[PDB]
Design a protein around this ligand. Sequence first.
Ligand code: 1WH
Ligand code: 1WH
Lengths: 728, 728
Amino acid sequence: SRKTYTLTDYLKNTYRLKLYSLRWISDHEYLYKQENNILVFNAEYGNSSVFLENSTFDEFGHSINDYSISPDGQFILLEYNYVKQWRHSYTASYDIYDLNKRQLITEERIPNNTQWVTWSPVGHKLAYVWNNDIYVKIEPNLPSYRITWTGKEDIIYNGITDWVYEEEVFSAYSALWWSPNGTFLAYAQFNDTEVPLIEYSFYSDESLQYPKTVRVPYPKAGAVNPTVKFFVVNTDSLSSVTNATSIQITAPASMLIGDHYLCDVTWATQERISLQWLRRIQNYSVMDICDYDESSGRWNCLVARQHIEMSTTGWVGRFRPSEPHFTLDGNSFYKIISNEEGYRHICYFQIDKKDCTFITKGTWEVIGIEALTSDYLYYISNEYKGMPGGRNLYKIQLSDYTKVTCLSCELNPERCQYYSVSFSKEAKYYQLRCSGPGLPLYTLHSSVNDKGLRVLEDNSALDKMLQNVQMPSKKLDFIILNETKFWYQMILPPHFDKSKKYPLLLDVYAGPCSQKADTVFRLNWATYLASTENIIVASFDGRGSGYQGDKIMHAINRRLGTFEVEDQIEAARQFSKMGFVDNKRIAIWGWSYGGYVTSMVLGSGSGVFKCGIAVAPVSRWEYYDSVYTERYMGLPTPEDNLDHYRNSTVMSRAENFKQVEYLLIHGTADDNVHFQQSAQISKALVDVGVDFQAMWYTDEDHGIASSTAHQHIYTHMSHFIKQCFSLP
Amino acid sequence: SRKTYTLTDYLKNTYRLKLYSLRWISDHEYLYKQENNILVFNAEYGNSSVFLENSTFDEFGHSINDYSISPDGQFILLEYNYVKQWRHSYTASYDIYDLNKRQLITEERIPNNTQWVTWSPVGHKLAYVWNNDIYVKIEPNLPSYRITWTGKEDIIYNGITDWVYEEEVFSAYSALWWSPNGTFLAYAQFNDTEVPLIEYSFYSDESLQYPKTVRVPYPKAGAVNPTVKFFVVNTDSLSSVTNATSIQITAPASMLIGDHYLCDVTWATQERISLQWLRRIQNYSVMDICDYDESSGRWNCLVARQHIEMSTTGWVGRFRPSEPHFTLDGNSFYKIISNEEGYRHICYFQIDKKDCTFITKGTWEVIGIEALTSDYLYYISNEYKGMPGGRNLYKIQLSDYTKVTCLSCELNPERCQYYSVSFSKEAKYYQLRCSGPGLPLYTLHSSVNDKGLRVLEDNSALDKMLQNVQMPSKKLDFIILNETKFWYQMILPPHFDKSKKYPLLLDVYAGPCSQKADTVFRLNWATYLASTENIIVASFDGRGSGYQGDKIMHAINRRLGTFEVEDQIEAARQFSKMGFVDNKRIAIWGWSYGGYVTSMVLGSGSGVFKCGIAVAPVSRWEYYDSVYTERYMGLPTPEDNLDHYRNSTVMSRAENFKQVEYLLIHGTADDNVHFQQSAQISKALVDVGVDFQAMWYTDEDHGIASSTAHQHIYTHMSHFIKQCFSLP
Ligand SMILES: COCCN1Cc2nc(C)c(CN)c(-c3ccc(Cl)cc3Cl)c2C1=O
Ligand SMILES: COCCN1Cc2nc(C)c(CN)c(-c3ccc(Cl)cc3Cl)c2C1=O
C-alpha cells in the first residue's frame, strides 16, 4: 500500500467519513441538505425535490449558521451571528422567512443575542429566551408576549440552564418544554445568587491591553448549589394587556427537606406532565405525575402516582435517572431500571399501581428505548454475542414479551456491530446507522415488515481511498482477572507480526460508566500512531466501566481514583505478558478523567510506565463540579467522605513522578476542568523537585479544539511520544 | 582530582560569599551584627562592645525578622510577622524595646499590619503608616497622632507609594521625608482612583477550593497614571484635640499643564526642601527650592530659583533625574548632569544663580556622589584604565578642581577593580567594598590622610574551599563595531584551550543603560555551565547600554527592540569567528528585558542561533508599565510613537521561530511583567503552527525566587541547554 495514515492526514482530514444527517418532519418525509440545498425526501418511494434552493438567501447579507423549519412547514427560522458559549449554550440572531409568500418577516423580529428559540411541536408558535427571560409569539409577524420579568445575568435564569445544569443535568441549554398540543409552555427557573464564582483570565486578541476576568457561577464539590423552580403557562390565554399567569408546580415534600435537582421533564399527554427530582445525595429519586385541572386551571401531583427510585450500592441510573416513555394514552410508561441482578433492563409501569414488570432480562443491558408503537417497543442493547461493546436494534412484541426480534444483527455481521437509530414520527420508518467495525453504513427501513428500503450512504468513496493506505487493524477481546471478563481493544500496526515486540500506548478514560473498548470505526490520533509509528494503542475497561452491570459499574462508588487506576496498571502488566509488547516502552495518556487517571497511574510508582501525557486533568475532586463529583464521591465533609476526597489527589503522589517522564497540558480558559487543577499539580511537583514537561494553551477551553490549537497539541504530543519511544 | 562547580553547588549555596554590612551611627562608630549579636565598633581603634546580646528576646515569642535602633540609642524597633508584597513594600508587626530600662512598651503599640515605620533622623520620634494613613509618636509609649484621614485601600496612599512609584520612581515603599532636625515630616500622597487594574489568579495552597483573584492598580503604557500631591506637617505642634494641619506644596506651573510625576525629595536644611518634578514625557524636569516662612507658617518656591533640565537626545537622567547633594549651609549643591559631549559629570549649582559649572570632564562617567565635606567631594567613576566596567573611589579638592586623587585604584589592582563605598556621618571614615574581579574584600579607612585602618573581611575561608575546585576564568575585553568600542565578557571553562571549539551561550539583558560586561566576581548559573558542562557564557553591551555616554545610551531612544537586538546578533557573529567557538552550538537566553531581546533575536531569522530561553519576557511594550515604557518609547498614540510600539512586538515575528528551539517560561503570579505578555507569545506561535517548549510556575512572581521554584527552573533550563548542545 506504500503510504501510511500520517499525522498530517489526521490534522488535515485527508480521508473524510461521509454522513447522512436527516430531519424527520412527519411519519414519512425527512429533510436533507445536499450541497446547500434543502431537499425533502419521501421515505416510502424515495423520490425527492428541492424544498429550499441554495440561492434563496444569496442576498441575505449574513452567513447562515443553521435553520429550523416549523412543524407545519409554513415558516423557517434562520440562525446567524452565532457566538458559542459552553458545551451547548450560545447566542445568535434570528430571522423568520415565510415559505408561502417567499419573503422575510420584518416586523416584531426576534432580538439579537437571543439565547434560545424553539417552535411549538405543532403549528407555528415560537418561544424564545432573551436576557434570561422567556417570550412567546403566537404568530411570526406579531408582537411577542413576555412571560417572565425576573431574568438577571448570572443570577436568575428563566427558560435556560445555568452552567452546572447545562453540563451535568440536562445536557442542553434549553429549559423550556412545549406540551404536545402547543397549548402549555413548561419551563424551569434557576437561581444562582449564592453560587460561588470561578474566576480566570481571558487574554483575547493581542490588541486588548488589560486581560479580562471571566466569572462564572460554578458549584465545586460541597459548595452552595443553584436552586430550581418549575412553572407551566397556558399559551392560548395570553393577553396583550395583562401579564401572563405562570402556575408553579412544587417539588415533592421528600425533596424540599434539602438540596435537590430537577433532572427530567416529560409531557405524557396534553394534560399530564412527568417530573423527576433527585436529592443532592444522588441515591434517591422521585418521579411526579401532574395533571391539569381544567376547572381550577392548576396542576396537581397526587402522591399516588409518585414513583420512587433508590440505590444501595451506588447512584441512580447511569448518569442520572432514566427517561420515561409513555404510551399514547399516558396511563402507562416504560423506563430502564437496574434489575435484581444489577443489569439494566426495560420496565413496564402502570400509573396507579405498584412495582413494575420487567420485559427484558439477562447478562447484558439495554442502552436505550428508541420508539414505542401500539404493537412494539424498539430498543438498542449489547446483547448480541455477549459483546458489551456492540449495539443492535431489537423490538419486543408487546402482546408477548418472549418474542424479541433482532433488527440489525444480521444485516452485515462482519461490517456492522454498532448501530444507532432514528425513527420517523409514529415510527413508520427508521434510518439505521452503523458506526463499525467496518466503514459507516446509513440505511432506511420500513417498520411494517422491517424491509430494507434503500442504502443512503455506504462510504464507498472512503473505502476506495483507504485501499491505497496501510491501515491499522483493530482487535477487540477480553482477559479474565478474577472470574470476571474485562474487555479491551488494541489498534494494531499494519502487517502486525506477533513475533516482533512493539511499544505500547495506553489510551485512557476509565471514568464511571465509560467504555473505551468497542466496535466503533475511528480515524484518529491512534490511527496515526499505529499506521505510521508502529505503536500499539490499547484501551481497557476495568472496574467502574459501564454497560456490564452494577457489580462492575458500582465497584468505584465513593472511591474514585482507586480500582479504575489499579486496573489500568494491571492491564498493562497483562499486555506485557503477550510476547508482542516491549515492556521498556509502555506509555499512557488521557484527557480529562483520563488525565486524572493517567497522573494517578504515573504517580503510583508501579514501574510499568516510562512516560505519560495528561491533558486538562482533574487533580483534586473538590475542584470539580458538585453534580458530577458528588454523584460518585458523596460530600467532602468529615461525617461523609472527606477522607477519600483527601486521599485521592494527584498532588500527594508527587514524589513518585521522579520515576517517569510526564507531560502536563491545559487550556487557560478551561471553564469545565479549571486550569487550577493543573496549576496545583505543577506546584506539587516543583515543591518535591521533580522535573516534568508542560504546555499551556492560552484562551483554549476543555476541548482545545480551535483548529490551530488542535493541530498544535497533537503535534506536540506526537513529538513527546516519539522521543520517549526513541522513534526518529 | 579537583571537583567542578556543579549545578547542585549553585542551587544549594555550597560556596557562600561573606559580607560585612555595617551601619554608621555617628562620625566614628558603626553597628555590625555577628552571630545575632549586635555590636558597636569604634572605627579609629577597632575596639568593640556588645550592644545587644543574641540572648535578648530569646523569649520574645516571635521570630524577629529585623530591627532598627533609634538615632540616639535609646530605643530599638523589633520587626516581626513580616509579609512581603512587591519589590520593596511589605507589611509587618512592631514592638519597641526601651534600652535604658529593660522592657518593651506594652501600651500605645504600633498596630499590626503596619506598612512602614521610621525613626526621625535624631532623637526618637516615629512616623508610621497604617491602613494607608500616616501616624506620629513623639515618645515611644505616648499615644500617636493621626496625620491623615484620606487613606483608602488601592485608591489613596499617604506616606507610601503605589505600585508604579514603588517600582519605577522611588525604588521604595516609603514616601516620607523627615527634616534634618526632626521638626517637619514631609510626605507625598497618591490617588489611583482612575488607574486601571491588572487582574490575575492566585491559586494558593492546595486547600483553597476557589482560586483568588488578585487586583492591582497598574497603569500600562498610555493608560491613566496616578496623580500626586506633596505635604509638610510641623511635628512639634501636634494637638490631641485638633487634627494636624498639612501645608501643601504645589508643583511648578510647567508641570501642572499636564501629566507629571514627583520624582525626588531632598531636604537642604532645617527649613528648605528640594523637590524635583518630571513631565509624563520624560524630556523635561523641574527642581523647586522651597523655603519655610516661620512668620507665615507656610512654604514658598521662588520661580526664579527653579532649575530646569531638558534632554534633546533622549530622556532625563539614567533612569530618573539625578539626586542633588547640598553643601552644609544649603545655598549650593552638586549633582550629576549630562555634559555637552554626552558624558555624565559633576556640576556645581549655586542657588540664586542660573547655569552651573562642571567639576569633572572626560570620556568616562561619574556613577555617583558619595560624600561631601567643606574641603572635598567624594565620587565613584569608571575612569581608571578607561574600563566602563570598573568602579573606583575618587575625591576632588573643592578649592582646586584639577586636583583629583584616586582613593582605591592602587589598593589591590589585580584583585579589586570594582568598588562601592559607605561613609560615616561627616565623612570621618569610610568602608570600601570591592566586588571583583577577585573575591570581595572589605576594608575600613580614615579620611584625614586616606590611611587604610584594617581589613574587615577578605573571604579567606571561601578562598580555601575554591582551591579544591576547577573554577572557570573570566575575560573582559572589547570588539569594534563601526569605529566604536563595545565591551563584552566571557566566562571561560577551566583549562581553556583556544584551539578546541566550545559551544557558546549568550547571556543577555541589554535594557536601556544596562551593563553586563563588568569586573565583578559572581558565583551563578553561568559559573556552573562553564565549569561543569564546559560552555562559554558570553555577555555583550551594545547600543543602548550605559555608563559610556549618551551617544551610546540614547541610540535606542523611542526605538526599543531595534539596535540593542541587532547588536546581540552581531556580537555572536563576531564571537562565532573566534577559533574557539563552535558556530553550530550558539544559544541565547535572558530574563525580563533580556527575555524580550532573546525572543526578538530568536525571531529575527538571523540563522545565528540554534536555540534560546526567555524567562518572564515582555512581548509588547503596550503591556508593561507607563513610567518605564514611556521613558524610552514615548506615548502609544498616532500623534506620537504608536507605529513603533506595533512594529516591535515579539508576536509579529512568530513564523521565524520554526528555525529554532524555543523555551518560554513565566510565573503565573507575576505582577511586574504580567503572565499575559508570555501568554500572547505562545498564542501567536500556535496560531502559526510553531512548536516550542513552555513552563509556567504556579504563584511565582517576577523573580521565580521561592527556594523550590528557583531550583526547578534552573534545573529545567540546564536540561534544555544540555540537550540542545548534545552534551551528555
Ligand atoms: C469518551 O470520553 C468522554 C469525553 N467527555 C464527554 C463528557 N461529557 C460530560 C457531560 C462530562 C461531565 N462533565 C464529561 C467529563 C467527565 C469527567 C470529568 Cl473530570 C470532566 C468531564 Cl468534562 C465528559 C468527557 O470527558
Ligand atoms: C541584571 O538585571 C537587572 C534585573 N533587573 C533589576 C530591575 N529593577 C527595576 C526597577 C526594573 C524596572 N522595573 C527592571 C526591569 C527592566 C525592564 C523590564 Cl521589561 C522589567 C524589569 Cl522588572 C529591572 C531588572 O530586570
